[PDB]
Design a protein around this ligand. Structure first.
Ligand SMILES: Nc1ncnc2c1ncn2[C@H]1C[C@H](O)[C@@H](COP(=O)(O)OP(=O)(O)OP(=O)(O)O)O1
Ligand SMILES: [Mg+2]
Lengths: 416, 95, 174, 95, 91
């Protein structure tokens, strides 16, 4: 009857029905029902208590997935913090939630969680987040290793530590042959976070220009895009033809170029995730892809094993300028802060500051600066620069090769 | 095809299916673009494939082939030496 | 491209002119119009609905705005009625007003019906003879008896918020 | 499809329903990518030639400019000269 | 009659009244069965041909579509080519 009143949209997905609202419809509700809303939420939780307990929740039941995520949500509005402790804290609840949800939603909930409860607990939340840092890397796989055993590794004490020792003691009398560890305070400089996006070897990753999110590819050649903070899946990409070689965000993070062995330069949208741009020109596999650092000009410089640069015009299907120059396969590629310029690197090691505006050569520093008078029959050493590092202004090019980093000044075409 | 022509084809059903020679008629029908070649293969296979079954399907399908299908069909009759049948038809159209 | 003539028919109909600041919704207009085309003859009702302020009226005005569908299809003029929301008494007046509007000649009795059904008769008869191919458009509509009243057996299309409204009515509904 | 095209179909619907032998049209339209198999099965399920034609037109009235053209072309290509002529002035600009 | 028909008449009813002679046109419409004898006498009884034309047109306006075509054919058949041209728009 509501749907007919056009106050709640229908969803005929299979037998199941999901009803939902417009953003405007929802906003009106809070506008006109806000005082009640804080009151009611308590109403929903108690009813759920009259039915399934959170431990009494099951995988088969249709509602449950809503239940963990919005179960967590409702209690917050309820403003009941002790009840919130009754739910979110429960490590087993974390176990089941991890089991089908994954270890990102809980982290996102925790940030919301911190304001809701107490500052002192916040530390407990800090201890738990620290307990999660070890979770991301191997936890998801499958053999959900008996956490109760892998848990007794944290330092200090925290709510987690205290919980773990008691659990272990309970396990121990029965059996389970848990082995105590006595050196933790003496060992491990913990990293703040770990991510496994792919079962298949990673090949490249890049920050969003905003820094809000990161995309990594892999040997499988699927690319996964994620927001690092809450550390929760924010993008799934079905496939890339061939094995991914490298990928990169657009300067406004509105696009994602994807290099590959196939030679399918698939510039998928960064939001919808649907493909937008696409390119090919290289005689060989692409070495690197990058969007123009300038907000204005839209270009796609691309090195490859054929040694030729390809300066794509992103506004056009065909390349703005093929650029032979490197005597060896390109090692890396980046746009200069001056979009008129386009630096490039390769195994010959010499920098090449191309003039993109003229579609012609402008400058190219030689790199024999790694002088080394060995007994080697070869003459002056043939430097092989890899990374094409930039100064924060990008006015000069930092590089590194063999045994030495260098900071060349391309504008003056000389070493510094 | 107007209703009067259609009605004529129904009224003459018995005579058409009894007397129509089809094997010799296909070329004529093609020449006057009354049927496409595949349409002809389909008509040829109608029912048991006998002359009568082909004839019947021909004259039924004829009703769909245009405003001038009937006079064009009489002409094809004439062109293939089926003057008697064409004559029976014409003297009705006029009648 | 509005024909000059289209505006002349439309003025008589009384549909509002589209707001100066508008933006066609070609796909939607096309769908209504093609569908609207569908009841080539014989009664029929079309319902259009959305959450409040979805362009529901403007589309109705826009769909008929075009010459092709209207001119070949609809020898009868188009009449628009703004139903709104009504108590039984209020509804009654709209009917008389539609009576006065439709009967420009005045050949029919100057006296107006005091009974809803009698107005229904004047509408049906007027639609049947006076305006043979006419299409009636309604605005809003919030309860069934209302369409019960307008249920003249002659095509009327109601545009609204509830889609429940056209359940009392009989005949093909899209 | 454009209102011009659709109204042209509506105007001539009866002529079209009387004459169209759908088996010679649906194939072209499927090849062209503007008629689906399930629509074709729905058509096939009608017991008589005119009922099938009626169903097919029902379906086409809801389709786009390209579809109308697909339909028109198939009509022309299959020798329905008179029927195509009826639909000629209603052809919409495409691509 | 149709909206465009009725309006085409109204749009040109003045040029019509200022030129057309009703008797021949009424002979046609009577034969076609789109005008009655009584209607014909009411028109004929008018003091001036402009009023007769005006009365005829007044009557045709409340008539069916076929009467619009009967009046149009009559005009053509009677030599009122330009006025029939103006009404071609109407149906
Ligand atoms: N091209 C356009 N199409 C649709 N709406 C437009 C357009 N340009 C401006 N608008 C705005 C201005 C109008 O206030 C509004 C159109 O009103 P409309 O869609 O008829 O609402 P409505 O009549 O369905 O509301 P209600 O359900 O209250 O009757 O949308
Ligand atoms: Mg409205």
């Amino acid at each position: 009857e509501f749907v007919n009143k056009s106050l709640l949209f229908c969803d005929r997905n299979g037998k199941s029905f999901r009803y939902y609202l417009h953003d405007l419809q929802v906003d009106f509700l809070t506008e006109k029902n806000c005082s009640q809303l804080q009151d009611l939420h308590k109403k929903i939780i108690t009813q759920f208590q009259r039915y399934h307990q959170p431990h009494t929740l099951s995988p088969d039941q249709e509602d449950c997935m809503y239940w963990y995520n919005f179960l967590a949500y409702h209690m917050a509005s309820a403003k009941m913090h002790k009840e919130l402790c009754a739910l979110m804290f429960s490590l087993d609840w974390i176990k089941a939630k991890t089991e089908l949800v994954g270890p990102a939603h809980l982290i996102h909930e925790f940030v919301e969680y911190r304001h809701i409860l107490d500052e002192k607990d916040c530390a407990v939340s800090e201890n738990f987040q620290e307990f999660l840092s070890l979770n991301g890397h191997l936890l998801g796989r499958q053999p959900f290793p008996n956490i109760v055993q892998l848990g007794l590794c944290e330092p200090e004490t925290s709510e987690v530590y205290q919980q773990a020792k008691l659990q272990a003691k309970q396990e121990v009398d029965n059996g389970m042959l848990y082995l105590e560890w006595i050196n933790k305070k003496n060992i491990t400089n913990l990293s703040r976070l770990v991510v496994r996006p792919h079962t298949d070897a990673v090949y490249h990753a890049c920050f969003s220009e905003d820094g809000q999110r990161i995309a990594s590819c892999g040997a499988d050649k699927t690319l996964q895009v994620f927001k690092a903070e809450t550390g929760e899946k924010l993008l799934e990409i079905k496939a890339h033809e061939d094995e991914v070689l490298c990928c990169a965000f657009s300067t406004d993070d509105r696009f994602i170029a994807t290099c590959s062995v196939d030679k399918k330069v698939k510039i998928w949208n960064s939001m919808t995730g649907e493909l937008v741009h696409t390119y090919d020109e290289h005689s060989e596999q692409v070495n690197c892809c990058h969007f123009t650092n300038s907000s204005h000009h839209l270009l796609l410089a691309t090195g490859s094993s054929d040694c030729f640069l390809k300066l794509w015009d992103l506004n056009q299907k065909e390349c703005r300028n093929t650029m032979f120059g490197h005597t060896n396969s390109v090692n890396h590629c980046r746009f200069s802060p001056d979009d008129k310029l386009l630096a490039s690197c390769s195994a010959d090691g010499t920098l090449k500051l191309w003039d993109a505006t003229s579609a012609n050569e402008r400058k190219s520093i030689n790199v024999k600066q790694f002088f080394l008078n060995l007994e080697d029959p070869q003459e002056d050493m043939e430097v092989i620069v890899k990374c094409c590092s930039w100064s924060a202004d990008g006015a000069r090019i930092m590089v590194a090769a063999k045994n030495k980093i260098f900071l060349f000044d391309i504008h003056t075409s000389g070493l510094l | 095809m107007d209703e009067a022509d259609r009605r004529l084809l129904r009224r003459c059903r018995l005579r058409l299916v009894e007397e129509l020679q089809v094997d010799q008629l296909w070329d004529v029908l093609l020449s006057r673009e009354l049927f496409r070649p595949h349409m002809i293969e389909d008509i040829q296979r109608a029912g048991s494939g006998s002359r009568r079954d082909q004839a019947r399907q021909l004259i039924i399908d004829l009703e769909t082939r245009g405003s001038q299908a009937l006079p064009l069909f009489i002409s094809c009759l004439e062109d293939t030496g089926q003057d008697m049948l064409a004559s029976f038809l014409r003297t009705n159209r006029q009648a | 491209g509005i024909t000059s003539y289209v505006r002349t028919v439309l003025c008589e109909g009384g549909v509002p002119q589209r707001p100066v600041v508008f933006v066609t919704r070609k796909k939607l207009v096309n769908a209504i119009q093609q569908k609207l085309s569908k009841l080539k003859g014989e009664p029929g009702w079309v319902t259009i609905h959305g959450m409040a302020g979805c362009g529901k009226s403007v589309l109705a005005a826009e769909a008929v705005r075009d010459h092709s569908l209207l001119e070949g299809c609809f020898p009868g003029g188009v009449h628009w009625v703004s139903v709104g929301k009504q108590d039984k008494s209020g509804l009654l007046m709209k009917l008389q007003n539609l009576c006065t509007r439709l009967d420009q000649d005045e050949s029919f009795s100057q006296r107006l019906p005091l009974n809803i059904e009698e107005a229904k008769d004047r509408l049906r008869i007027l639609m049947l003879r006076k305006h043979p191919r006419s299409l009636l458009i309604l605005d809003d509509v919030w309860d069934s008896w209302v369409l019960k009243a307008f249920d003249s057996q002659c095509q009327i299309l109601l545009t609204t918020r509830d889609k429940s409204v056209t359940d009392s009515v009989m005949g093909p509904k899209y | 499809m454009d209102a011009k095209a659709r109204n042209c179909l509506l105007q001539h619907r009866e002529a079209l329903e009387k004459d169209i032998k759908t088996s010679y049209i649906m194939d072209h339209m499927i090849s062209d990518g503007f008629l689906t198999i399930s629509e074709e099965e729905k058509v096939r399920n009608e017991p008589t030639q005119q009922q099938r034609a009626a169903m097919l037109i029902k379906m086409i009235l809801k389709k786009d400019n390209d579809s109308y053209v697909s339909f028109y072309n198939a009509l022309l290509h299959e020798g329905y000269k008179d029927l195509a002529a009826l639909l000629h002035d209603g052809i919409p600009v495409v691509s």
